[PDB]
């Protein structure tokens, strides 16, 4: 139930059982937003976002839920979208200052720590609130191969084979576990990433939605691109038939 | 010396002789020049010494020697002397003893206009060239004695002056409009239901004596105490949510619930169920639970007017289980106070062998027995919520030089607050629900090792409650367990001489 | 002055430390217990040097002491760079107690939960001061802090006599920690530091065991 | 009559749940308190009149002038405190001289009113900028929320809403300046129940051909004796 | 208001520092370190909470320098932040002073950072603790530990996390009868310690072991099949 | 009565994962008068309804110049609209100074939502209580971006914000398929008809209280005054 | 709110009376008793700001000594930049704008303004300032100002008879028999600031008693 003491008004304050509630309250905005998933294959990383459309007046392409943070890394966000656009602009500046200092494309194990220590740094002070956005990052390279990391609003960053963030993250993960993705190729999982979105979408409550897809992998020379209008339409047909 | 001698004369005053109040009105009646300091000499003597609790065959040797001489003085002053506050302490005592022999109707608009004026309410958006003569004022606790002794008349004239009083000041009881006035104004709500109930005890259940009873014409009717609650129920529910606490409202709401439960309990529990599950505006759960505890006697007792009371017993009792949280301690104390004041009224016994064919169960009473299937689910979920209340409150040894050995005052209350509120559940409990809950205590307190400072006094007190309720079935398994493991862990090696024992 | 009164509660909960100014020396004796045998007894030190001739011990909070032992070492070398002489013990405590006062003054920062005992040697005359969390500092002949310091200062007042030498002050300092030890003190459970004409040095634990045979 | 507070009344940078800022409005409501000033824009100029409120006869009237001179072609009238607005007259005077220095022009009345309002705790004064520009004579109101607007006539002060209802009845867009000097002093006799003299009003007009001109004790006498 | 920031109690306690130790127990894990006569071993639980985790990215052992190892126990996001200061302060020592930082002076550096969180009210303590292991040039192996309070003591064996108190009593009992260890069979002491108090000992791919030795001072995390050798012999 | 605890500052998450202070600032765009924006793959048009303090006063600068190819429309606090408009003007000047080209309308709106998000995360400051409709014309065609006090932004086929704009969003969602083929004079009628449904039945779109902002292909951004909207209101 | 706490010390501080004449301007304050053993030199309340300007005060003697030594710099920092002495309105506008919270004093700034014009001003603690022919500040200021309203017109014939039958006669309305309880100041046009010694202060009272 409720608590009237002020152990949840700042993220610079522990609870008397050792919890930071303002972090745990920040991952309720993520747990209420629409579902974004990302599955890694043997040759790349595919994202897929259930993008809710809130008005028919909005143009197709508004509220871009799949960002490009470098020319080899993508980003699929959940939660409070205005905070996600600020962590997109931090992830771009971190990837930009890496090439300006070290002279090559930033690794994804290191990009998702520079960003995760930016998210963590706002979970410490009474002057700033934690971010209301979990997000994913996926890249592909000759050196590192395919990698997919997720960052929580606490700042923890793990590496995943498949991920889900949003309100149907529990139902999406049990669909991603049905996949055996370590042997499948990158084009065959765009069929499957779009399949899991149409499953976990509750069309009773949420009215209507677009589908955003974006890969990064060996079939586009290791750059992150939005899935074209042909391959996204086929995956939206293989899903809606299933 | 000042208060002992007044409370001695007050104890000797009803035994003064009948010819000895005109004897008393002859001595200080020459001191009543209203210009010197010698008048409050007389008016304090009048408040202390004058006999008012006289039998009705002696009122001609009583107040009628001095009432119209001195209420006519009181209505003519319009300053506020130091001796006006003595006459309201005199006229209240005159009113509360001689109910039905004063006609307060020629003076009742002049009385309520000064009780209102003694609240000193800011009115007018500049509202003051503030008179500093109003330091002296009316003790409203003596005024509550003086309103209450006027209500039972046939012409219900004082009743609408109470409805005219509260409805003129309802905006000041609102929890956004707090100020300097609120200390007299919460105190008014604390005392008028406390005093109407005592007048009802004085005329319905008190045994007769040589003190004169109220006449049958001046006695509070069922309409008169219904119309009293309905003009005070809206200011007491706004006082429930005040910034200064909910202590004065819940003491008002208790005494209103003795009179008219069907009119006072549903407006409270309509605000209680949204308070136990809100996660926003947490102040209600501190304040609504504080008000159900005064309600609690009138709530579990289904009378001939409010029989749906104990239907609200168990759902309020189950939804209060998240209130035992190791994060608030203001919620946790008022939750321990909440469940211990319910689980000393209702036995925690399953009713399923009575849920067979039996014509004793009414429509409301059969609805109770089917809801008693969650009594075991209350006690076992009370323990799984209190075990996390303990195991997350163990003492952390941070500083490497010192040893914090004192349980603090805020933690010593949570020991005794769980020593109270668990020993009252587990006593008011069937032996079938006891022994399935004894094992929950034993399988907790013996599979763990607690720090003996904070969690040591606090687990063992929760076991102490399990033994004081059935000492046979509980001591069959604790003292064989503990003695078989002390002799294992002490006398095996030479741990007689040591520096630190095994924990 | 509310937090300052509460920081002294953190001092008086701390481990006992005893300082006695002898005729030719100063002794700083303290309690270094370990909660388990797992703690390395010689890893951290409570009696701690500042100059070649100044050392200081504490009673109170461990980590707040290291802030003051890092500033007192700077303030002793900022003196030595300017004046090219070892800092007077009176002048060091004025600068350390100004640092401890500086955190009571500024808001949003709690005071130190540390009292200090600061020995020293200047011009052939010994010095023993005590700096409080308030920023106050007092010159002492003999004092004590920590747990049971009220019993310690009454114990010192009966067994102090200003004609005693430095070797006689090491005994009456360990005898003051003996009264409020609650155990059996080995060479590791206490830490003694002496300050004389030769300078400050904390005693090696084999040197302390000779004094524990009394 | 009675005090009816809400819980969203005592926070400055805090929106009320209807989207209001009640620690802004209650400051602004606490500013309609000083002597009433009335400005009227005409096609031959703009008048500016104000009540004065002098207590003692020894006090010289020429030093509580609540109408000032911004530049030679712009006047200004205050309501609030005379010291609360001294930091708004200073910027208005300097910005007309920054504009003259940089651009060799007279700054328009709208741009002085815009530059003053760019400073927006909100202000404790509301202002009436009267001036003659390339657009002719103009009058701008400068509400303490930093909101400025062009006005044909606008009364500020304590009895403003009530003098503004009188300005709506007496104004028309073919009005001469010698009317509006007398038509506003009718309204200053309404909004304070005293007789007019040289000690309770101040009046100043900005014509196209002339500069800003504060009326003297002879010119104030020759107008009051008409009405 | 003395429970929502790091100021003193009327009894002289810092409640947020005590609540920060409870934040270490929220991770649900436990780490055990132990010192040998020529070696130093750390042992953690490696819980894989989701089947979709790349388990190579879930760890708590970190290289701080080439020959100083770490193990973080507590809040995972605070743990990666306090590694990053140890990564920085150990490489800043090498640039300012020309030699590898000791495990003495790296804990004292990290704990002095952690004290500032316990004195300024504008920031919370980190709810995680660091256990640094490493070989000194002149003192042999060292096993030290920082806490959220700021204490940097030196250890013969230590523990952290949910089973900290229970693992201490296992390590105290072995450190009293013998010299607590000998050479790299000291690994067998720590793995039994984490398996006695947690009462599972299920698989040899659910822990993580790191070592420094005298004959090889660099911190090397043992592999799964390398750690199965100590567990098949356990 | 219901004293919420999680809406003092903007840095306090509620247990619902819902910042109240940002949601309270989004209700401040419902406080201004209604404004309509819409585009046609030719000219992008802002239509606005203005209020006056009294009679004998001008109404309001409701549509503001930003650059030659961008205009905005105020709804909410003008104190925060003037603060954002001087940011958008200078950013358009900085791109014009450096690259010598018009700033892309998609990219300036990204610069607002980066600026707007900063007061919604740091203590003390309040969110910008203003919502802008931004009409533009870039190389990719016209644009009707919408900004909110919650700092996300919305590309729109057409959008009306302000008070009683839900009756205008109902109008625009019914006729949005016809907008992409209109002329200039036909599109503004659709803007005036959308603005009309925000009025009562006893109020009219006079030329004194209607302001129209238009940018297009070869047409630079120009607002239309109290008399220049008469060729648009007459044919209606 | 905060300015109201400034005025409460003006109403309790010692009286300060100033009139303005054709040729001379006069301040006069009520010299209070100090103590039996207090040297009464450091408690004088007529301070000179520059060679052509001086002021009295009433209020906090701590916050006055801040106001005086800030106005004494602006009297001299004016002469660096302008080379002309201060007008009396310049230093009055400086003191009023100098008065977080305002400094809790009310002053009677008098003097001459480089064209020989006599001046008399008053900085109320609100930040406001305006001109005066004759004025009073202090504990009995309302009654002294009512006395000076009665007497202004035909007194400026002689600068001696102007400035005792007004100024000492206005202090004598509130203050004692005089001589040791009046600190009186007088400055001619561009001569100096002279504080009259009590050998000459008791001289003028004897003409008033006659």
Short mmCIF file of N, CA, C and O in Angstrom, two decimals, chain A residues 46-107:
data_model
loop_
_atom_site.label_atom_id
_atom_site.label_comp_id
_atom_site.label_asym_id
_atom_site.label_seq_id
_atom_site.Cartn_x
_atom_site.Cartn_y
_atom_site.Cartn_z
N UNK A 46 18.14 -7.98 -34.79
CA UNK A 46 16.89 -7.45 -35.31
C UNK A 46 16.11 -6.85 -34.16
O UNK A 46 15.96 -7.49 -33.11
N UNK A 47 15.62 -5.62 -34.33
CA UNK A 47 14.71 -5.00 -33.38
C UNK A 47 13.29 -5.03 -33.92
O UNK A 47 13.06 -5.19 -35.12
N UNK A 48 12.33 -4.86 -33.02
CA UNK A 48 10.95 -4.72 -33.40
C UNK A 48 10.14 -4.05 -32.31
O UNK A 48 10.19 -4.48 -31.16
N UNK A 49 9.40 -3.01 -32.66
CA UNK A 49 8.71 -2.18 -31.69
C UNK A 49 7.22 -2.15 -32.01
O UNK A 49 6.83 -1.78 -33.12
N UNK A 50 6.41 -2.52 -31.04
CA UNK A 50 4.98 -2.24 -31.10
C UNK A 50 4.78 -0.75 -30.89
O UNK A 50 4.78 -0.27 -29.75
N UNK A 51 4.62 0.01 -31.97
CA UNK A 51 4.47 1.46 -31.86
C UNK A 51 2.99 1.80 -31.86
O UNK A 51 2.34 1.73 -32.91
N UNK A 52 2.46 2.19 -30.71
CA UNK A 52 1.07 2.60 -30.62
C UNK A 52 0.86 3.93 -31.33
O UNK A 52 1.62 4.88 -31.13
N UNK A 53 -0.17 4.00 -32.16
CA UNK A 53 -0.60 5.26 -32.75
C UNK A 53 -1.76 5.81 -31.93
O UNK A 53 -2.72 5.09 -31.61
N UNK A 54 -1.65 7.07 -31.53
CA UNK A 54 -2.58 7.67 -30.60
C UNK A 54 -3.60 8.58 -31.26
O UNK A 54 -4.61 8.91 -30.64
N UNK A 55 -3.35 9.00 -32.50
CA UNK A 55 -4.30 9.80 -33.25
C UNK A 55 -4.09 9.52 -34.73
O UNK A 55 -2.96 9.39 -35.18
N UNK A 56 -5.20 9.45 -35.47
CA UNK A 56 -5.12 9.25 -36.91
C UNK A 56 -4.53 10.46 -37.63
O UNK A 56 -4.11 10.33 -38.78
N UNK A 57 -4.49 11.61 -36.96
CA UNK A 57 -3.88 12.81 -37.50
C UNK A 57 -2.36 12.75 -37.53
O UNK A 57 -1.75 13.50 -38.29
N UNK A 58 -1.75 11.89 -36.72
CA UNK A 58 -0.29 11.78 -36.69
C UNK A 58 0.21 11.11 -37.96
O UNK A 58 -0.37 10.12 -38.42
N UNK A 59 1.29 11.63 -38.52
CA UNK A 59 1.81 11.09 -39.76
C UNK A 59 2.57 9.79 -39.48
O UNK A 59 3.08 9.57 -38.38
N UNK A 60 2.58 8.91 -40.48
CA UNK A 60 3.33 7.66 -40.40
C UNK A 60 4.82 7.97 -40.34
O UNK A 60 5.40 8.46 -41.31
N UNK A 61 5.44 7.68 -39.20
CA UNK A 61 6.80 8.08 -38.94
C UNK A 61 6.96 8.98 -37.73
O UNK A 61 8.09 9.23 -37.31
N UNK A 62 5.87 9.48 -37.17
CA UNK A 62 5.94 10.21 -35.92
C UNK A 62 6.25 9.26 -34.78
O UNK A 62 5.90 8.07 -34.83
N UNK A 63 6.90 9.80 -33.76
CA UNK A 63 7.36 9.08 -32.57
C UNK A 63 8.23 7.89 -32.96
O UNK A 63 7.88 6.73 -32.74
N UNK A 64 9.36 8.21 -33.59
CA UNK A 64 10.30 7.19 -34.03
C UNK A 64 10.89 6.48 -32.83
O UNK A 64 11.68 7.05 -32.08
N UNK A 65 10.46 5.24 -32.63
CA UNK A 65 10.86 4.43 -31.49
C UNK A 65 12.10 3.61 -31.76
O UNK A 65 12.56 2.88 -30.87
N UNK A 66 12.66 3.68 -32.96
CA UNK A 66 13.91 3.03 -33.31
C UNK A 66 14.89 4.12 -33.72
O UNK A 66 14.74 4.72 -34.79
N UNK A 67 15.89 4.36 -32.90
CA UNK A 67 16.87 5.39 -33.18
C UNK A 67 18.12 4.78 -33.79
O UNK A 67 18.35 3.57 -33.73
N UNK A 68 18.92 5.64 -34.40
CA UNK A 68 20.27 5.30 -34.82
C UNK A 68 21.22 6.13 -33.98
O UNK A 68 21.21 7.36 -34.08
N UNK A 69 22.03 5.48 -33.16
CA UNK A 69 22.95 6.21 -32.31
C UNK A 69 24.36 6.24 -32.85
O UNK A 69 25.16 7.10 -32.43
N UNK A 70 24.71 5.35 -33.77
CA UNK A 70 25.93 5.46 -34.54
C UNK A 70 25.63 4.77 -35.85
O UNK A 70 24.52 4.27 -36.06
N UNK A 71 26.59 4.77 -36.77
CA UNK A 71 26.29 4.15 -38.05
C UNK A 71 26.37 2.64 -38.00
O UNK A 71 26.11 1.99 -39.01
N UNK A 72 26.71 2.06 -36.85
CA UNK A 72 26.70 0.62 -36.68
C UNK A 72 25.84 0.15 -35.52
O UNK A 72 25.71 -1.06 -35.34
N UNK A 73 25.23 1.05 -34.75
CA UNK A 73 24.46 0.69 -33.56
C UNK A 73 23.05 1.24 -33.69
O UNK A 73 22.86 2.38 -34.12
N UNK A 74 22.06 0.43 -33.32
CA UNK A 74 20.69 0.88 -33.20
C UNK A 74 20.25 1.01 -31.75
O UNK A 74 21.00 0.75 -30.81
N UNK A 75 19.00 1.44 -31.59
CA UNK A 75 18.46 1.70 -30.26
C UNK A 75 16.95 1.56 -30.30
O UNK A 75 16.29 2.24 -31.08
N UNK A 76 16.42 0.67 -29.46
CA UNK A 76 14.98 0.46 -29.34
C UNK A 76 14.57 0.76 -27.91
O UNK A 76 15.00 0.06 -26.99
N UNK A 77 13.72 1.76 -27.73
CA UNK A 77 13.46 2.31 -26.41
C UNK A 77 12.09 1.86 -25.91
O UNK A 77 11.23 1.41 -26.68
N UNK A 78 11.90 1.98 -24.60
CA UNK A 78 10.58 1.85 -24.00
C UNK A 78 10.33 3.02 -23.06
O UNK A 78 11.20 3.88 -22.90
N UNK A 79 9.15 3.09 -22.46
CA UNK A 79 8.95 4.05 -21.39
C UNK A 79 8.66 5.46 -21.88
O UNK A 79 8.02 5.67 -22.92
N UNK A 80 9.14 6.43 -21.11
CA UNK A 80 8.84 7.84 -21.33
C UNK A 80 9.69 8.33 -22.49
O UNK A 80 10.91 8.43 -22.37
N UNK A 81 9.04 8.65 -23.62
CA UNK A 81 9.76 8.84 -24.88
C UNK A 81 10.62 10.09 -24.89
O UNK A 81 11.66 10.12 -25.55
N UNK A 82 10.22 11.13 -24.15
CA UNK A 82 11.01 12.35 -24.08
C UNK A 82 12.34 12.12 -23.39
O UNK A 82 13.34 12.74 -23.76
N UNK A 83 12.38 11.22 -22.41
CA UNK A 83 13.65 10.85 -21.80
C UNK A 83 14.47 9.95 -22.71
O UNK A 83 15.70 9.94 -22.61
N UNK A 84 13.81 9.19 -23.58
CA UNK A 84 14.54 8.32 -24.49
C UNK A 84 15.26 9.11 -25.57
O UNK A 84 16.32 8.70 -26.03
N UNK A 85 14.69 10.24 -25.98
CA UNK A 85 15.35 11.09 -26.95
C UNK A 85 16.54 11.82 -26.35
O UNK A 85 17.41 12.28 -27.09
N UNK A 86 16.59 11.95 -25.02
CA UNK A 86 17.76 12.54 -24.39
C UNK A 86 18.86 11.51 -24.18
O UNK A 86 20.04 11.86 -24.24
N UNK A 87 18.50 10.26 -23.95
CA UNK A 87 19.50 9.20 -23.91
C UNK A 87 19.89 8.72 -25.29
O UNK A 87 20.88 8.00 -25.42
N UNK A 88 19.13 9.07 -26.32
CA UNK A 88 19.63 8.90 -27.67
C UNK A 88 20.71 9.92 -27.97
O UNK A 88 21.74 9.59 -28.55
N UNK A 89 20.49 11.17 -27.56
CA UNK A 89 21.45 12.23 -27.81
C UNK A 89 22.70 12.12 -26.95
O UNK A 89 23.72 12.72 -27.29
N UNK A 90 22.64 11.39 -25.84
CA UNK A 90 23.84 11.11 -25.06
C UNK A 90 24.60 9.95 -25.68
O UNK A 90 25.83 9.98 -25.77
N UNK A 91 23.88 8.93 -26.16
CA UNK A 91 24.53 7.79 -26.79
C UNK A 91 25.18 8.18 -28.10
O UNK A 91 26.17 7.56 -28.50
N UNK A 92 24.64 9.18 -28.79
CA UNK A 92 25.27 9.68 -30.00
C UNK A 92 26.53 10.46 -29.68
O UNK A 92 27.54 10.32 -30.38
N UNK A 93 26.49 11.29 -28.64
CA UNK A 93 27.67 12.06 -28.27
C UNK A 93 28.76 11.18 -27.68
O UNK A 93 29.95 11.50 -27.81
N UNK A 94 28.39 10.08 -27.04
CA UNK A 94 29.40 9.17 -26.53
C UNK A 94 30.05 8.40 -27.67
O UNK A 94 31.27 8.19 -27.67
N UNK A 95 29.26 7.99 -28.66
CA UNK A 95 29.80 7.32 -29.83
C UNK A 95 30.59 8.26 -30.71
O UNK A 95 31.52 7.81 -31.39
N UNK A 96 30.25 9.54 -30.72
CA UNK A 96 30.98 10.54 -31.47
C UNK A 96 32.29 10.93 -30.82
O UNK A 96 33.27 11.17 -31.53
N UNK A 97 32.33 11.01 -29.50
CA UNK A 97 33.57 11.35 -28.82
C UNK A 97 34.52 10.18 -28.73
O UNK A 97 35.69 10.37 -28.38
N UNK A 98 34.06 8.97 -29.01
CA UNK A 98 34.95 7.83 -29.04
C UNK A 98 35.78 7.83 -30.32
O UNK A 98 36.99 7.61 -30.29
N UNK A 99 35.12 8.07 -31.46
CA UNK A 99 35.82 8.13 -32.74
C UNK A 99 36.70 9.37 -32.83
O UNK A 99 37.73 9.35 -33.50
N UNK A 100 36.33 10.44 -32.13
CA UNK A 100 37.16 11.63 -32.10
C UNK A 100 38.40 11.46 -31.24
O UNK A 100 39.32 12.29 -31.33
N UNK A 101 38.46 10.42 -30.41
CA UNK A 101 39.58 10.19 -29.52
C UNK A 101 40.34 8.91 -29.82
O UNK A 101 41.56 8.88 -29.67
N UNK A 102 39.64 7.86 -30.23
CA UNK A 102 40.26 6.57 -30.44
C UNK A 102 40.27 6.14 -31.89
O UNK A 102 41.04 5.25 -32.26
N UNK A 103 39.43 6.73 -32.73
CA UNK A 103 39.58 6.60 -34.16
C UNK A 103 38.97 5.38 -34.79
O UNK A 103 39.39 5.00 -35.88
N UNK A 104 37.98 4.76 -34.16
CA UNK A 104 37.28 3.65 -34.78
C UNK A 104 35.88 3.61 -34.19
O UNK A 104 35.54 4.40 -33.31
N UNK A 105 35.05 2.72 -34.72
CA UNK A 105 33.67 2.62 -34.26
C UNK A 105 33.63 2.05 -32.85
O UNK A 105 34.36 1.11 -32.53
N UNK A 106 32.79 2.63 -32.00
CA UNK A 106 32.78 2.26 -30.58
C UNK A 106 32.22 0.85 -30.42
O UNK A 106 31.27 0.48 -31.13
N UNK A 107 32.83 0.01 -29.60
CA UNK A 107 32.27 -1.32 -29.36
C UNK A 107 30.97 -1.23 -28.60
O UNK A 107 30.70 -0.26 -27.89
#
